[PDB]
Design an enzyme around this catalytic site. Sequence first.
Site, short mmCIF file in Angstrom:
data_model
loop_
_atom_site.label_atom_id
_atom_site.label_comp_id
_atom_site.label_asym_id
_atom_site.label_seq_id
_atom_site.Cartn_x
_atom_site.Cartn_y
_atom_site.Cartn_z
CB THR B 1 -12.78 50.05 12.05
OG1 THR B 1 -12.73 51.25 12.82
CG2 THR B 1 -13.68 50.18 10.83
CB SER B 72 -17.72 55.51 5.91
OG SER B 72 -16.72 54.68 6.52
N1 LIG Z 1 -17.11 54.47 11.85
C1 LIG Z 1 -15.81 54.70 11.20
C2 LIG Z 1 -16.07 55.01 9.74
O1 LIG Z 1 -16.95 54.45 9.13
O2 LIG Z 1 -15.32 55.93 9.09
C3 LIG Z 1 -14.95 53.44 11.23
C4 LIG Z 1 -14.64 52.89 12.60
C5 LIG Z 1 -13.35 52.26 12.21
N2 LIG Z 1 -12.90 52.80 11.13
O3 LIG Z 1 -13.69 53.76 10.65
#
Ligand SMILES: N[C@H](C(=O)O)[C@@H]1CC=NO1
Lengths: 348, 188
Positions: B1, B72
């Site tokens: 992310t 998420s």
């Molecule tokens: N896939 C995770 C989410 O959507 O919570 C992301 C990856 C980075 N930060 O969170």
Amino acid sequence: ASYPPIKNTKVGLALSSHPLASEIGQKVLEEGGNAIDAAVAIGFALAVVHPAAGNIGGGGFAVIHLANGENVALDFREKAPLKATKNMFLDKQGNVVPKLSEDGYLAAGVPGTVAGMEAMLKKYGTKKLSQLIDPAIKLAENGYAISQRQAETLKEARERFLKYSSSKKYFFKKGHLDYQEGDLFVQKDLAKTLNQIKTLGAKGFYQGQVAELIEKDMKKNGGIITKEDLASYNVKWRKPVVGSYRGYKIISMSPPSSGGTHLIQILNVMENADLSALGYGASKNIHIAAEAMRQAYADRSVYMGDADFVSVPVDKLINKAYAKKIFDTIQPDTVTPSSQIKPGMGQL
Amino acid sequence: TTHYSVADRWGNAVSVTYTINASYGSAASIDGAGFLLNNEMDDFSIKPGNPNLYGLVGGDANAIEANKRPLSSMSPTIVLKNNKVFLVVGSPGGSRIITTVLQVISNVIDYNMNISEAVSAPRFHMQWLPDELRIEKFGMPADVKDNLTKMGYQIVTKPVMGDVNAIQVLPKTKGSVFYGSTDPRKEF
Ligand SMILES: N[C@H](C(=O)O)[C@@H]1CC=NO1
């Protein structure tokens, strides 16, 4: 001590985790673009210069406050494909198939990023997509030098890349040699894709030749995303989740994120204490926060999902009376072990 | 992310967190198109009670269904003061996002840190399972550790959490001043 903040007194700031992308966003502001224009330029630039995280093959969220006082949330989160099923990652015994949700083509949701960038530009931007995407295209075509950190993360992913003929083309040099710090990293096929987007907009990703490449590679490698998935991908403009903390308004991401809800929940619990009295790093303050977190994450495990499919009690979770009930269970000298925590405190 | 934050002279602000999930996503690219696929399907509960990449668990609410968006933890956030932009904040970190963003906001509002201080300040984390208080190296001195341990926390020092890009906006006579911070953790 900490280094001083970056300062601007003229056009604002555009900040990302890659200086080339930040510079691109900042130049958009210098050239009279608004925050959305800059955000769109950054989204595409990071897709080129920060491929570990920045992307066009993923998705995300944008929380936006407009000059007219409106607050909106853009959901460009990936969707499970049309052929997705509840137990798709399990074997015949009902056990998880190692790595199937992690490595390769079946692990992917339908990408939302390109649709998200276009959606915010169309609704709230002032500059043309061509102007905003050109810097990213330039970097893909001409390349940029691999940083020390990128050499490191590339090495950590090396064995994963080697599972896929496609990634072996893009993430290794001639002779399938590792990219090293200072090497020029050129992305010719990415530039082609970005150029389709430049010329046709989001339809250059979700339809036509690029959509054809996605379906083809999916069929070849055990994935399930099709042209139908891509043509049906939809962003959603959603209401943000909104709360208050000590006279400030908190605007954050609503379902299908859990983030905004639990952020506001945990702050609500904390609001019951005068944290300023003891200051940063005090064990009493850490304790209050940590117990609020403990309850919030238990609640997450039961109550949270895509609200278009399941009922998500956002309003109950961000209710200050619920937060007060949580706060009142916090003892000065002891924790509540996670084994004793009940989602919703058993009373939601 | 990765998270990015933007604020302009007119009062617009945009806080964007986006991702392919893991570092380099699924590690599989679309041949001919030059981009990596996400592994966002791992953010679903793929089996009830099964922990994912971030040790998060679920059941029915976050089960897989066709067209459904996986849950998420991303928390792109804007804080307002008198309906005007005060903070633009967010971070990567999967399960750690929520607690990272909370701490930056609290550091400003509760403790009157500038935005650089608020971002650099050591972070802690509790996500219920595992039942541990996660800290950063040099982030908690003996006296604090001992008092929290006496309460019953199992304190564990783990790699740095998050990568916050944040903006604070303050009024002046003519227009505003914009203060920004990247995160020292970026290159760790
Ligand atoms: N896939 C995770 C989410 O959507 O919570 C992301 C990856 C980075 N930060 O969170």
